[PDB]
Design a protein around this ligand. Structure first.
Ligand SMILES: [Mg+2]
Ligand SMILES: [Mg+2]
Ligand SMILES: [Mg+2]
Ligand SMILES: [Mg+2]
Ligand SMILES: [Mg+2]
Ligand SMILES: [Mg+2]
Ligand SMILES: [Mg+2]
Ligand SMILES: [Mg+2]
Ligand SMILES: [Mg+2]
Ligand SMILES: [Mg+2]
Ligand SMILES: [Mg+2]
Ligand SMILES: [Mg+2]
Ligand SMILES: [Mg+2]
Ligand SMILES: [Mg+2]
Ligand SMILES: [Mg+2]
Ligand SMILES: [Mg+2]
Ligand SMILES: [Mg+2]
Length: 123
RNA sequence: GCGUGAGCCCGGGUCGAACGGCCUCUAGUGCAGAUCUUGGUGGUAGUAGCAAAUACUUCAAUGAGAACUUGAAGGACCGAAG
């Protein structure tokens, strides 16, 4: 179980999609700030896409925290997962994607010994 | 799943030989436009159309397949500045 923490509030779950990326396939959905002189999104017309702002920033107490209350730490081996020995209530280990199956099993066993949560343990 | 965001990480599939994090150093380093360059691909669309030069028809053979292959017969044109 994670450390006691204030409830996690996101202030927003949507992704801030790029303007007209829904209409043009040459445009990736990744956010781009519209620099056009006449742009309605830039000028903040009612009923349009919202632009990201620092006001959407998450609470400093719960930033980078997954819903279980843990912060993800990427591990590539057993020695990496052993760095979380003193942090099993604040940090959860995420096994790197390019780790072989046997090394994944070793990391999972060591994390079970240490009491460290693994976010992608099932395989 | 994380980040306000650019982005980052993971699960599954495909795949087959290299690759990444951190601190510095470096630059031919970030694209929707430029009637931009090269290449590829659409709707239009099975659409416009394939209509000058009189014209083809019967039987048989060949052949998987015959109006525009061939034989025979008929009907026609060029009509000696052909
Ligand atoms: Mg978000
Ligand atoms: Mg103006
Ligand atoms: Mg090879
Ligand atoms: Mg350049
Ligand atoms: Mg382009
Ligand atoms: Mg531009
Ligand atoms: Mg072109
Ligand atoms: Mg075309
Ligand atoms: Mg037609
Ligand atoms: Mg015509
Ligand atoms: Mg015709
Ligand atoms: Mg004719
Ligand atoms: Mg026959
Ligand atoms: Mg004919
Ligand atoms: Mg005549
Ligand atoms: Mg005559
Ligand atoms: Mg003469």
């Amino acid at each position: 179980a994670a450390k006691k923490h204030v409830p996690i509030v996101k202030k927003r779950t949507k992704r801030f999609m790029r303007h007209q990326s829904d209409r043009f396939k040459c445009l990736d959905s990744a956010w781009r700030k519209p620099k056009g002189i006449d742009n309605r999104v830039r000028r903040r017309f009612k009923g349009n896409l919202a632009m990201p702002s620092i006001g959407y920033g998450s609470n400093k107490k719960t930033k980078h925290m997954m819903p279980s209350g843990h912060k993800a730490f990427l591990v590539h081996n057993v020695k990496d997962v052993e760095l979380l020995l003193m942090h099993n209530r604040t940090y959860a280990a995420e096994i790197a994607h390019n780790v072989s199956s046997r090394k994944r099993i070793d990391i999972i066993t060591r994390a079970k010994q240490l009491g460290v949560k693994v976010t992608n343990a099932k395989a």
